[PDB]
């Protein structure tokens, strides 16, 4: 089955084989399709198909609701009708069959998504938000006009929201192990802390296992242990912006006596049921208004250290120990000991079924 959309005038119709285009880091699945035109009533004699990657986002200074500013991050256009002699491209397996079914009035088009591009990520809107989704979302636009610079008509264009998604790698990586050693003032004996997750790659809804090992040799007593999972998102529109948001926190009242060890296993699971009110949280790309899980981590192109546009989502696990206060310095010093454990949170590669849109609709 393929997806088709028709213009309000009915003269233009475009066919897409899918809506999610998997990103393999080094290569991206091509965006192929077929455009059906009727030149008898079409006097413009030119048909243009445009793929656009835009960072749609609201405005706080403007009091108008719903209005957003559109900033294109990647724009590519290919003209289908009339067939361009220079734009000769091979036909995919699905593309050739669509031409045969429709007839001789259907012409193909094919785009190549370049690498080092953002994935479809939609920030969670607030309760008072009534406009379109905010974030990065691709779009396939088809229209007929005399020239590119000519004004576009609402009745003479079609648009489909497509997605660029990534899935969990087949090969697991090294186990994330991080340790710290804090040296105090009263005594030279250190306060050791170790933490290690079970595996690097976790799935959406799969529990996260944290192993905590505390080797206390100081004179102070640890009061509370805080374990949290935080979502790190990087936005690069005009300047790089870093912000954090905890999606799952669990506090333990474990107390470690001086000159004693400690060992425990903690289980955490990030989910959207308790994070509904956290405005600004990053979620996977929505089509229109569907419910989507937390944004999956983005697989960066090795250690290229490039400034990727759009939104880059990453996760970490923080283990924090609360140390008792008092003594000489009182409540002025900061004696808390912390350590961070990065991990990857994605989806397994689906076998046949692509991601669907609210399978049991209300």
């Amino acid at each position: 089955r393929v997806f088709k959309k028709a213009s309000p005038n009915g003269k233009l119709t475009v066919y897409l084989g899918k809506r999610d285009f998997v990103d393999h880091i080094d290569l991206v699945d091509p965006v192929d399709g077929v455009v059906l035109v009727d030149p008898e009533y079409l006097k413009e004699r030119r048909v243009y198909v445009t793929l656009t990657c835009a960072f749609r986002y609201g405005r706080e200074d403007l009091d108008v609701l719903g209005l957003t500013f559109r900033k294109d991050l990647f724009v590519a256009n290919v003209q289908s009708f009339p067939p361009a002699p220079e734009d000769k491209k091979p036909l995919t397996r699905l593309q050739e069959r669509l031409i045969k079914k429709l007839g001789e009035h259907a012409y193909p088009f094919t785009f190549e998504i370049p690498p080092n591009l953002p994935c479809s990520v939609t920030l969670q809107p607030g309760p008072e938000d009534t406009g379109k989704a905010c974030g990065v979302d691709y779009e396939v636009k088809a229209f007929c006009a005399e020239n590119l610079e000519e004004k576009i008509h609402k009745r003479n264009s079609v648009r489909l929201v497509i997605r660029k998604v990534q899935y969990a790698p087949e090969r697991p990586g090294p186990q994330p192990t991080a340790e710290t050693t804090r040296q105090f003032l009263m005594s030279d004996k250190p306060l050791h802390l170790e933490a290690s997750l079970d595996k690097e790659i976790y799935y959406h809804g799969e529990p996260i296992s944290v192993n905590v090992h505390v080797t206390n040799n100081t004179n102070k007593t640890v009061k509370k242990i805080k374990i949290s999972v935080r979502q790190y998102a990087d936005i690069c529109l005009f300047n790089t912006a870093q912000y954090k948001c905890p999606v799952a926190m669990e506090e333990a009242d474990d107390t470690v006596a001086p000159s004693s060890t400690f060992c425990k296993v903690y289980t955490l699971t990030p989910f959207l049921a308790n994070n509904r009110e956290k405005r600004g949280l990053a979620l996977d790309g929505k089509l229109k208004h569907e419910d989507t899980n937390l944004a999956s981590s983005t697989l960066l192109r090795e250690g290229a250290n490039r400034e990727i546009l759009g939104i880059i989502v990453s996760y970490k696990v923080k283990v924090k120990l609360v140390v008792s206060r008092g003594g000489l310095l009182g409540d002025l010093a900061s004696s808390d000991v912390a350590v961070e454990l990065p991990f990857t949170l994605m989806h397994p590669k689906p076998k046949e079924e692509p991601p669907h849109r609210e399978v049991p609709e209300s």
């Binding site: 393929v2 069959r97 669509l98 489909l160």
Partner: peptide, 9 residues
């Protein structure tokens, strides 16, 4: 209006 579905015969 709405994105419909169809089969390539």
């Amino acid at each position: 209006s709405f994105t419909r579905s169809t089969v390539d015969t």
